[PDB]
Structure formats: structure tokens, C-alpha cells
Amino acid sequence: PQITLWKRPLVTIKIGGQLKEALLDTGADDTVIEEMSLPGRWKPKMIGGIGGFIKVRQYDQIIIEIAGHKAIGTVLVGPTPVNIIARNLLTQIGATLNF
Amino acid sequence: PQITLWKRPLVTIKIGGQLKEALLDTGADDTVIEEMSLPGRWKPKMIGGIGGFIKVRQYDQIIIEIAGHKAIGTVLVGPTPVNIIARNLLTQIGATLNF
Ligand SMILES: CC(C)CN(C[C@@H](O)[C@H](Cc1ccccc1)NC(=O)O[C@H]1CO[C@H]2OCC[C@H]21)S(=O)(=O)c1ccc(N)cc1
Ligand SMILES: [Cl-]
Ligand SMILES: [Cl-]
Ligand code: NA
Numbered sequence: 001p002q003i004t005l006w007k008r009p010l011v012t013i014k015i016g017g018q019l020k021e022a023l024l025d026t027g028a029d030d031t032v033i034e035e036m037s038l039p040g041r042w043k044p045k046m047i048g049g050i051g052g053f054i055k056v057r058q059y060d061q062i063i064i065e066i067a068g069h070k071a072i073g074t075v076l077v078g079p080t081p082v083n084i085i086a087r088n089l090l091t092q093i094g095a096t097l098n099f
Numbered sequence: 100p101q102i103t104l105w106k107r108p109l110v111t112i113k114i115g116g117q118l119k120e121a122l123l124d125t126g127a128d129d130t131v132i133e134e135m136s137l138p139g140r141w142k143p144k145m146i147g148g149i150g151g152f153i154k155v156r157q158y159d160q161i162i163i164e165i166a167g168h169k170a171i172g173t174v175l176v177g178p179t180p181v182n183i184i185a186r187n188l189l190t191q192i193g194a195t196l197n198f
Contacts, residue, residue: 001198002195027126050149050150050179054150099166099168099189
């Protein structure tokens with residue numbers, strides 16, 4: 001699809017069996033999702049942006065379906081105010097910025 | 100251009116005669132740049148990012164060049180980790196997300 005940016009580029013994602021809304025975010029390095037349980041091992045990480053840092057759990061090799069497209073990669077889980085699909089998974093679905 | 104996301108989508112901007120690096124950020128509503136002097140009056144604004152809220156200075160109708168495309172619009176000035184070009188100016192230069 002071609003998504004204009006008049007509004008927030010929100011899409012539906014499926015992760016851990018759950019449906020969620022998420023923002024497509026070229027300004028983010030790693031995908032960050034609101035608190036949920038995921039399978040497998042994790043390790044702690046701090047990630048930072050405007051307003052400072054939050055502590056997250058880093059899970060590797062997690063599958064997410066993004067707007068109908070399957071991608072696999074690292075997912076961070078913690079108290080983010082919005083679900084963010086970042087460049088680590090946007091590359092996998094072939095997403096580009098065009099102007 | 101067509102910009103892939105394997106690396107940070109950094110571009111050169113020109114504001115007040117000065118070149119700076121900025122990140123093209125579809126996950127941002129308004130454009131935020133590190134402290135610098137801009138002409139005219141400013142209005143208060145709070146913006147909420149990943150780690151909480153911060154106060155910035157809002158300047159309206161600022162001329163900015165972005166990767167060679169001219170935009171004129173609202174620029175926020177405050178303690179951001181990196182200069183971010185958000186959807187309010189990405190729409191002015193005709194940017195879209197594609198996959
Ligand atoms: C500041 C950027 C360098 C990085 N951020 C991604 C960015 O797109 C966030 C994504 C975002 C979006 C909503 C809330 C929090 C974070 N947008 C943002 O902070 O925009 C602020 C300015 O315009 C406003 O509209 C959105 C909030 C304001 S970040 O959320 O802090 C972040 C940092 C590291 C990772 N791995 C994932 C995300
Ligand atoms: Cl990854
Ligand atoms: Cl103030
Ligand atoms: Na894992």
C-alpha cells in the first residue's frame with residue numbers, strides 16, 4: 001500500500017496471537033510494544049527518546065504479522081505510550097519512504 | 100528519492116542559513132530540533148515521547164529546506180536526542196510510506 005502522512009500511519013498487527021494497533025515509525029531503530037507476555041528468553045534493555053529512557057524486555061526471533069505481512073525480529077516490551085513498528089521490522093516487509 | 104530503512108533515514112536540512120542533520124520520522128507528529136535561535140515569537144508546547152513529557156518552544160511559519168525540498172511550517176525547539184523531521188513537514192515535501 002501507499003500511506004500518506006496526513007494522519008498517523010497506524011496499522012493492525014498480530015503478535016503473540018493478539019491483535020493490536022501500531023504506528024509505522026521510520027524514526028525508531030527497534031520495535032517496542034506495550035506490556036504483554038511473549039514466549040522465550042529475554043534480557044533487559046534501556047531505550048531512550050524524547051522525555052528520556054524506559055526499561056524494556058528484549059525478546060529475539062519474534063514473529064509479527066504487519067498489515068498482513070509476516071516479519072521476524074527483535075521486539076522490545078515495556079511501558080511505551082504507543083505500539084511502534086520500527087525499522088528492524090519495516091525493512092523486512094520492504095517498506096520505503098518516497099518523495 | 101526512494102529511501103530504504105536498513106540505516107537511519109538521515110538527511111541534510113537547512114534552517115537559518117545553517118546545514119544540520121535530521122531524521123525523517125513518520126512516528127512523529129511535529130518537527131523537533133535541538134536548541135538554536137529562530138526568529139520571531141514562540142508559544143509554549145508540551146510533547147510526549149517514549150520517556151515522558153517535555154516543554155519545547157513552538158515557532159510557526161519557519162522556512163526549512165529538507166533534502167533539497169522547501170517547507171515552511173511549525174518547528175519545535177527543545178532537548179531532543181536528534182533533530183526530527185515529522186509528519187507536519189513530510190507532508191509538505193510529498194513523502195509517503197510504501198510497502
Ligand atoms: C525520538 C526518536 C529519535 C525515537 N523515537 C521514535 C519516534 O517516532 C517517536 C514515536 C512515539 C510516538 C508517540 C509517543 C511516543 C513515541 N515519536 C516521537 O517521540 O514524537 C514526538 C514529537 O511529535 C509527537 O508525536 C508523537 C509524540 C511526539 S522513540 O519512541 O523514543 C524510540 C526509541 C528507540 C526505539 N528502539 C524505539 C522507539
Ligand atoms: Cl531484529
Ligand atoms: Cl514555557
Ligand atoms: Na526468542
